[PDB]
């Protein structure tokens, strides 16, 4: 239950070469620890695995390359003795939990509630197979309705250990049917930081900051993960979709990301980067921006894969308000300006101006940046063909094919 | 420029201000993207209603 | 003209349902003229029995 | 195309042809029906002289075009009768590109941008092209102009066009059909 | 993804068997279908999951930022010169 | 065995005939047998494989013929001679049969069945040809005996329909023959072949029959295609007479292909684009229209390089097709990077996979396309960029030489700059803010126009049905 994000967290740290190493010897023995604890030697074996090559080299199951640098990711053998002891002394005890309370009055409940324990007791040693298959019998007879979303939500943690996407979604569209029946705003709340989480794995982060950003307000961590992850990753998906306006109310004004104040890293480093964006200073925005990255970005398991975007945007976002308020500029100023040099800011300017963000040109032969981005009549009427051009394409494929048959 | 109270555009290699002040949109343009956008989720609407002939 | 194109397409979507609605009713028509066909056979059986 | 040896050769001087009378598309309406038996079967080996040449003018790179056929003519045998033509089509080209390129060159920078060899040369081409010379300077405005004038001696350019008040008759009628 | 919205041409052409003549017909003439022919050929079609984080098959919706080599090294190298640069200005 | 085989083999094709037979002999609906053929053919072919080879033969008997047989009995030969319970007394029968027509009517001589029954019985021919797989004695003889009949018939409504059909497997049968093996009797008879479609195109459109209009066409510019002759095949479009009057969409869907390629090196890629897009939206999308889908999605892409545009990279990732447009994806980055020392080692690699398609053409091209891409990114970052700045960039060998290549681009209109050659820069000229010009109203002509259209196809398809409905009696 618990342990799952711990792990998993800890785990990705290893994997990654762009932290360095006294930070991933740090995680390891913490975790390695936790492992032989925990049992949670199935999910073990799925981290040497998934990788593979560059890490999970260096283990009794595998044959050992130079490519690890970790060897406290490396078995033991009384791991699996200790395993499948344990794995027999709790199942066993739950089997003839179910056997005796076929007797006993009302054992639609009870039997029920034996089949929730052998879930935890799956959920603790990381092998969410067989916990698919109890949790589906407890669901099936008859327990409280409320229950029944806690269920579902549990095998949907599982699916965020593992970290498949597609068998976390179906989970969570049962919890968002069962949702408004059961009208719980208790698992409505645990509802948007799970969903939270996949929604920051998804590419879109406007739905993300919807979710991430109320779910400070009144947060949960009843069989849920800290608050300081949470924050966190709201942050991020708020310094993106939010406008200078509602980044002033929803993050820099918000009370109870004031309240957290700066106990993590993290934390630290995400909060500098939007401050220094709303008060407009440019020297320090470009040695905070490399930290958040550092420091916040690559830990995070689900950031990994929006690390690059998080980059290209942040530079893009600091330029839009800046190009938007000046009519020019100089090469020279611009680039003192955020602390680099002029030979640097051309080839950053060279990214994302032919992908036609910004809208503006670089005078080499004066030396300006000049601003010329279109507001008149002019951008406005190419908007609106698109749409249009979409519809005319659409009515053709629909029409015809109905004159056919 | 950006708190939007006379929104203007500042020349750093020129040195000068031009204010501006005018209007940053027409009525009609804007009533016009609800409009077409209405009309892109309607066609597909229908041939759901209508790919019984299929 | 702007406006007037905006209402030039709305207006092709109205003209195109009335199709679709026709070729549903025609769909329909098809089955119907066929149960015919098969139904005065069963209208014939009777008069020879009764 | 073939069974002789002099197959090479020919099918060399058919494309060649082509380009001195400087269509394109007939030059790749041609190349389409040799390139299945040639391709591998023959190879390129005088057939890339013409290829390589047709390459470099629709890359824009007309200075190596013009140096292909001068080292084409360290190898000369019966190459001559197309080299005279085929210098006349590279100068042709940059003429009426530079048009949309420039206002107004000196005598000598026309000279070398264009490739003239001599310097009568370089006012020759003037009168032809009907660029005025004023000033010892080719002016490339007043082709611009040229150009202008022949467009409103039509008469095709009304419904063409297309006056405000027939577009608004035109939209109007479509529906009192 | 193919012209437009796919998801609409889908929705608009199926299998019917007076159709079904005609797709094969087609098909024929064009030359085999030219999916299951490759992998013949070329020894299996090697399309990377292990080298992006949205992989070939698009789980949703793709970065264009595996078009681009990582620009934080970049960023970081970029940084530093400055700093002695700045220093000695 | 083999009459219980045959009998029951011959009972299902006798429903099959009886559907074809009220609509031809009682004058038809166009529309409506057109697409019955169409299913008839997928359990025909099915069926001749089923129960031996020589049902159709005992078929053909059976049923009236004035000589049919004999042409039936020689194709047997080749799959190996079988001629049991295939002649009278065993596959004889003029009762039931208003195909054969009654023992009574025979005798009078004063019924004719031979003509419509003749033109079916070749489709089975012709089936057999391809359920077999074989070629040899079958590509020639079918040819040969088939086609002086449908020349001996006056060439009836009814009758063209029927063997519009025929034609497909003739062509797909004698080209197979003709990629197989080297010889020149086969491009000797690859021209009495053309020569023949051509003939029969004009004789179809005397008489005003869409199917075999359309079908003829198709067929013959695929061979101008392999051939490589543009010049022909853009003659022969401009004739200008194509259907679409008592077509199906696929045949659109072909059309248009084909144009898309003579367009497209006849260097207007412009047109060969929009009907690129129309050709795929046209065909029908299944998995068994998986050719058409793959070799247009690929070609569509290569028009867009041509153009200067990049397809999408979405395209390729989502496509189900993916495998397959592996070198397309890196085609259309090496294009985007500007990279030259990209471009050229990649089409090394996939020099043969491109020659399959028929898009290494389009690529010999590409070449010059690389140089259009990298000062168009050049363009848009910088406005007033130095000459020599340019050069390091993209490694140009001189200041002249780099100003040549600019000056072929803002020729033709896309980079839109304007050179300085004494002041030694170049100056983006584009800025646009044309709705203070009066290009918006010819864009706004071709909006409404386009809007105008559909409004008059709705109108006339709609009432059509409705008609004949009314017309029949209803429950």
């Not at chain 1, 200790?82 to 939990?97: A, M, Q």
């Not at chain 2, 929104?7 to 201000?17: E, H, P």
Request: aromatic share 10%.
């Amino acid at each position: 239950r618990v342990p799952n994000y711990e792990v998993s967290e800890k785990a990705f740290l290893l994997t990654q070469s762009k932290v360095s190493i006294e930070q991933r010897k740090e995680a390891a023995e913490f975790v390695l620890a936790k492992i032989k604890e925990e049992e949670m030697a199935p999910y073990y074996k799925y981290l040497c695995e998934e990788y593979l090559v560059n890490n999970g080299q260096s283990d009794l199951e595998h044959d050992e390359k130079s490519d690890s640098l970790n060897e406290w990711i490396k078995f033991d053998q009384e791991l699996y003795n200790e395993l499948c002891k344990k794995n027999e002394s709790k199942i066993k005890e739950l089997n003839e939990k179910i056997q005796k309370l076929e007797e006993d009055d009302e054992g639609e409940l009870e039997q029920a509630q034996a089949w929730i324990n052998l879930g935890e007791y799956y959920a603790q040693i990381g092998d969410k197979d067989n916990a698919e298959k109890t949790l589906g019998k407890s669901l099936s007879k008859a327990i409280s309705t409320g229950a029944k979303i806690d269920v579902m939500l549990t095998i949907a943690r599982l699916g965020f250990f593992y970290n498949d996407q597609l068998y976390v979604k179906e989970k969570l569209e049962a919890v968002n049917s069962m949702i408004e029946k059961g009208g719980d705003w208790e698992r409505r709340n645990r509802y948007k930081t799970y969903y939270g989480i996949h929604c920051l794995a998804v590419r879109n982060f406007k739905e993300a900051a919807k979710l991430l950003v109320d779910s400070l307000a009144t947060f949960t961590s009843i069989e849920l993960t800290s608050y300081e992850s949470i924050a966190t990753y709201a942050s991020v998906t708020g310094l993106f979709t939010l406008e200078r306006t509602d980044l002033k109310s929803k993050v820099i004004d918000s009370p109870e990301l004031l309240s957290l104040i700066s106990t993590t890293a993290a934390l630290q480093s995400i909060s500098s980067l939007t401050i220094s964006l709303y008060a407009s200073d440019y020297a320090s925005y470009f040695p905070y921006l490399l930290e958040t990255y550092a420091n916040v970005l690559i830990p995070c398991k689900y950031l990994n894969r929006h690390a690059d975007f998080f980059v290209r945007e942040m530079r893009r976002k600091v330029y839009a308000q800046l190009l938007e308020s000046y009519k020019t500029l100089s090469l020279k100023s611009m680039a003192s300006a955020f602390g680099v040099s002029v030979a640097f800011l051309d080839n950053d300017l060279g990214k994302f101006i032919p992908n036609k963000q910004l809208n503006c040109v670089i005078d080499r032969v004066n030396g300006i940046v000049e601003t010329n981005r279109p507001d008149n009549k002019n951008a406005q009427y190419h908007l609106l063909v698109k749409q249009g051009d979409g519809l005319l394409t659409k009515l053709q494929k629909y029409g015809a094919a109905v004159r056919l048959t | 420029i950006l708190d939007k109270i006379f929104y203007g555009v500042l020349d750093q290699g020129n040195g000068w201000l031009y204010v501006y002040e005018t209007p940053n949109q027409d009525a009609t343009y804007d009533s016009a993207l609800e409009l077409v956008g209405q009309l892109n989720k309607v066609v597909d609407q229908l041939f759901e209603k209508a790919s019984v002939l299929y | 003209i702007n406006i007037s194109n905006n209402l030039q397409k709305a207006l092709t979507v109205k003209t195109n349902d009335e199709l679709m609605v026709i070729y549903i009713s025609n769909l329909v028509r098809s089955i119907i003229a066929f149960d015919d066909l098969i139904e005065n056979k069963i209208q014939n059986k009777k008069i020879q029995e009764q | 195309l073939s069974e002789s040896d002099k197959k090479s050769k020919l099918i060399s001087l058919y494309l060649l042809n082509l380009l001195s009378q400087n269509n394109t598309t007939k030059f790749h309406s041609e190349l389409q029906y040799l390139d299945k038996h040639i391709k591998n079967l023959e190879d390129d080996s005088l057939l890339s002289y013409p290829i390589k040449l047709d390459r470099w003018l629709m890359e824009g790179s007309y200075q190596k075009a013009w140096d292909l056929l001068q080292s084409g003519s360290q190898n000369i045998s019966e190459f001559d009768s197309f080299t005279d033509i085929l210098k006349s089509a590279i100068r042709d080209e940059i003429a009426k590109n530079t048009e949309l390129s420039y206002d107004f060159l000196p005598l000598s920078n026309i000279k070398a941008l264009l490739f003239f060899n001599n310097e009568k040369e370089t006012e020759k081409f003037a009168l032809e092209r009907n660029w005025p010379i004023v000033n010892s300077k080719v002016y490339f405005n007043n082709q611009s102009k040229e150009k202008a004038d022949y467009e409103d001696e039509m008469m095709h350019e009304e419904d063409q066009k297309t006056n405000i008040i027939e577009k608004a008759m035109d939209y109007a009628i479509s529906i009192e059909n | 993804m193919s012209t437009d919205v796919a998801a609409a041409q889908a929705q608009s052409k199926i299998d019917l068997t007076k159709k079904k003549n005609e797709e094969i017909n087609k098909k024929s003439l064009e030359e085999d279908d030219e999916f299951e022919d490759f992998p013949i050929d070329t020894w299996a079609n090697g399309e990377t999951i292990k080298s992006n984080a949205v992989t070939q098959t698009n789980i949703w919706e793709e970065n264009w930022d595996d078009v681009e080599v990582d620009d934080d090294f970049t960023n970081e190298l970029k940084a530093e010169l400055d700093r002695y640069k700045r220093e000695n200005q | 065995l083999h009459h219980s085989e045959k009998k029951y083999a011959e009972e299902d094709q006798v429903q099959e005939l009886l559907k074809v037979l009220n609509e031809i002999s009682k004058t038809t609906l166009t529309l409506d047998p057109r697409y019955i053929w169409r299913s008839l053919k997928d359990l025909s072919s099915l069926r001749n494989q089923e129960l031996l080879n020589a049902e159709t033969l005992c078929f053909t008997v059976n049923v009236l013929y004035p000589d049919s047989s004999s042409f039936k009995k020689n194709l047997l030969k080749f799959i190996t001679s079988n001629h049991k319970s295939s002649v009278p007394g065993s596959a004889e029968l003029r009762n039931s049969y208003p195909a054969s027509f009654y023992s009574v009517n025979t005798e009078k001589k004063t019924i004719e069945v031979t003509a419509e029954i003749n033109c079916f019985m070749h489709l089975l021919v012709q089936l057999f040809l391809w359920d077999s797989k074989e070629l040899e004695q079958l590509v020639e003889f079918n040819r040969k005996v088939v086609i002086p009949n449908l020349l001996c018939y006056y060439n009836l409504r009814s009758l063209n329909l029927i063997n519009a059909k025929l034609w497909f497997y003739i062509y797909l049968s004698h080209e197979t023959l003709a990629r197989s093996s080297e010889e020149i009797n086969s491009d000797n008879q690859n021209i009495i072949l053309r020569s023949t479609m051509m003939k029969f195109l004009k004789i179809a459109s005397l008489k005003h029959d869409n199917e075999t209009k359309a079908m003829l066409i198709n067929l013959i510019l695929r061979d101008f295609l392999n051939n490589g002759e543009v010049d022909s095949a853009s003659d022969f479009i401009s004739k200008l007479e194509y259907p679409h009057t008592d077509v199906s969409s696929s045949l659109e869907a072909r059309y248009f292909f084909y144009l898309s390629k003579i367009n497209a090196i006849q260097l207007d890629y412009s047109t060969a684009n929009e009907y690129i897009i129309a050709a795929i939206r046209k065909a029908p999308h299944n998995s068994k229209s998986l050719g058409f889908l793959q070799q247009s999605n690929k070609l569509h892409c290569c028009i867009q390089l041509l153009m200067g545009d990049i397809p999408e990279l979405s395209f390729f990732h989502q496509s189900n097709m993916q495998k397959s447009l592996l070198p397309y994806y890196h085609l259309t980055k090496a294009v985007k990077l500007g990279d030259l020392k990209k471009f050229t080692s990649t089409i090394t690699k996939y020099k043969q996979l491109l020659l399959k398609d028929d898009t290494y053409q389009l690529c010999v091209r590409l070449r010059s396309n690389v140089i259009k891409t990298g000062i168009r990114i050049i363009s848009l970052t910088y406005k007033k960029i130095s000459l020599r700045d340019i050069c390091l960039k993209l490694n140009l060998d001189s200041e002249q030489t780099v100003e040549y290549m600019v000056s072929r681009a803002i020729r033709d209109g896309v980079i839109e700059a304007k050179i300085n050659h004494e002041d030694g820069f170049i100056e983006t000229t584009e800025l646009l803010n044309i709705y203070d010009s009066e290009d918006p109203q010819q864009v706004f002509d071709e909006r409404i126009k386009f809007a105008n259209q559909l409004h008059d196809e709705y109108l006339v398809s709609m009432r059509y049905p409705e008609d004949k409905k009314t017309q029949q009696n209803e429950k």
